[PDB]
Amino acid sequence: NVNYTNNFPNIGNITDEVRNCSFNVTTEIRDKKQKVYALFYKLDIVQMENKNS
Amino acid sequence: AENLWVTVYYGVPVWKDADTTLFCASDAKAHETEAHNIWATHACVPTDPNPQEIYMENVTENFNMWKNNMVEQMQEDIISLWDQSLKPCVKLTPLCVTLSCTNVTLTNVNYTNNFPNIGNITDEVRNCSFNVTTEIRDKKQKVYALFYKLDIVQMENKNSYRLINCNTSVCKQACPKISFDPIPIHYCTPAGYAILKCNEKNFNGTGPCKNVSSVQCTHGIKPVVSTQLLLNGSLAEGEIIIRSENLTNNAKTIIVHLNKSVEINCTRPSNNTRTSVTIGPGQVFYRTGDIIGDIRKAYCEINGTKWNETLKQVVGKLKEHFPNKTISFQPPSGGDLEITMHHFNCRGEFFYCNTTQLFNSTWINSTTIKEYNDTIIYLPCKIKQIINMWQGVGQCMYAPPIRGKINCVSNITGILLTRDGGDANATNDTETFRPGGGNIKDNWRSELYKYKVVQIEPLGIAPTKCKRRVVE
Amino acid sequence: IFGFLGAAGSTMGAASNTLTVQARQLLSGIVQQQSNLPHLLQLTVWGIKQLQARVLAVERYLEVQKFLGLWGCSGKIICCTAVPWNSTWSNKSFEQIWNNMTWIEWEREISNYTSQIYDILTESQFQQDINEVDLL
């Protein structure tokens, strides 16, 4: 990104608040899976077990 | 005078234009067959055995087709009926898999009643086969079916197809116990309303009609659905009548409504079997097992001279509105498969006919009366199974195959045309009309054009010489 | 001798002899029947249009019965009131009103004032009932 980020209210930034999670879903046809990444806010995911999952 | 007083008359024949909720009413004889039709269900109240029409003599009323609110109500009713019928049926998500598809090798009798001599259903059908898991690990069993080429698409890794609908929507297989036969529907108003019907024989779309009659509710309107020709309905009385919202606006479809019917005869000479394979818990999927015996492309026969003279009369009427320009029909220019091909329904099977020998001609000056032979015109029609009847408002459907031979004989009572907007042909005077076009509402503006809903105002005030007797 | 709305073209004089023909049919209809045969049939798409057709018929009848109750004309077809037509609503002669005019044309050319005749006809009846209270 841009380095300066227009730090006028200097409150912070949204690093350490989002997570880049990769998972497997199914395509239109069931039998072929695919791997998809998405940016999820840290308030929408929980850590169940087997750390980093 | 100076001695007039207000008098209240209750029951005066005064109405006003209004929009209401026309319920359904159908006769008992057509139903009670326990076939459970889609549209004209049992929920409609029985109609009156003796309908009453009353002729208002000195009444001229402003009828306005293309702004009738009875067409919109019928469209919403048809859509709701189609959505409601398919709701309890079986989804086809488990069939959204990878099918490996190859050619078909059919055996047949030799003659096959080679009267039409059109072709055979090969190069239009395919085997598609797909895996099912079994007890032994890493072992699969092939399940076979015959699919039409219009219902499978090749994604990647050639010789590996998939169903057409698997990336657009979920399609429910039509339940086999419901019928697609159009049973007539009468649209009846509540008490306090009436339907004014224009009895004028040579009556265009909009204007003052001077032969109004009062009906309680309409006649039998069949919900038959077709695209290029208005099949299997009601004929005009006076003569061939051409109606459009504005004949100088080429974006407006033209409806030619005939006074003599022309019989079309559509048939599927093939042998289609049927086999059921269970998909999921309790749900089953019906598929075309094999085609053993006769193999031939489905086709429609139309008498040559009947159409050949109906076109002549239609051209004679068209040339009135376009005076000095020669009229020549041409085949459709493009679009979806429901526009380029005459789409209709026959015993639950969905046909798409070609119709190019019908609409390819020219009419220059009628210089000579050329005689011809009594010939029969054959139209080759494809068949589709995955049906998307309405573009994005309707629920998708899968039509199970029908065992045996299929044959529907129908009436042609209308044509849909669309004009091409020539600009610089001031010296080359020519007009070209192309069939098809229009939405589904134009199938019902050809039946609800005579009617107009009004609401009665039975309370009137006039001056008389009554004075109320004061009590004392 | 005429049918429903059969006198809509006749003159007002000759079209007031068939008032009962258009008056018998403000509730009567086909809708009151149940069905061809008795899922959830009561919430079919055409099981709902019948439910709202029954309510529309009832409300349409009660819009005119509401007025006749206030005007004092309940139980009558041609009710003679005590409101003097002041000729501002219409100055047409008695001959021209009843002798080449139809009921539809008449309603149109006084359509501007029916909102005021209705309120006057109610006030005259109320003033009648007050006068009897302190008279009997």
Place this chain on the structure above:
Amino acid sequence: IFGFLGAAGSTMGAASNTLTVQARQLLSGIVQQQSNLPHLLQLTVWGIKQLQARVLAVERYLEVQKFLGLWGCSGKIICCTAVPWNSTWSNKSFEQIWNNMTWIEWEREISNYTSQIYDILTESQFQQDINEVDLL
């Protein structure tokens, strides 16, 4: 004093002295109550039968009040009329009717002609108004 339909077996003479008990109960019902306790409860199986039992109660009241309005009997329990009995409908004497029949048997003998007696009643009231507009 009798209750609802309590004098249905008594003769027409003595069953006509309790017309008010069967007349107070053409609209009043339990159905006007809301529920035991107040998703979309207006769509429950028990909540649709209660909606159509309110429209049925209203409609069954109006189809008898509509006739009373046309005959000029609005607001009356017993209504005389200027329509003479032709005895083709029934040729019995006065004593054989009011002292030898119940209301149910009487309504079964003239079930042929009620479709015609209603039309004669409507025309008579209409002919009273025309004979009174062109007379005052």
Place this chain on the structure above:
Amino acid sequence: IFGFLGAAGSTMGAASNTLTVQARQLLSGIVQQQSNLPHLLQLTVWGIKQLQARVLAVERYLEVQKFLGLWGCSGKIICCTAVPWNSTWSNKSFEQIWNNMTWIEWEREISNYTSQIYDILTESQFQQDINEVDLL
């Protein structure tokens, strides 16, 4: 003049000159309009809260029109009856009722006996109809 319920605070004798203001608004409303623009739009959350508003308006209006019909006061706003006042419902004088109370205060005072006055008023009208049958 006053609007709807505008004279709710005035005395009984002075708020009785505005009865037509609250009597003209028992069926008229906004509910009769269809919608801003017209699946199954009649099963929306506000398609049922409007269907039951149309039925509530009808039953509320027909609830008092039933009593007016029985009592013989159909088509009248102020109706005189032949039922004497026994003063056990209320023994206040003429000047302590029409010039000192309110229509809300008065109707709360005799709320005990309104269930009986309705029965007496209905039966008194029935006796009037019996008398004229054996009189004409």
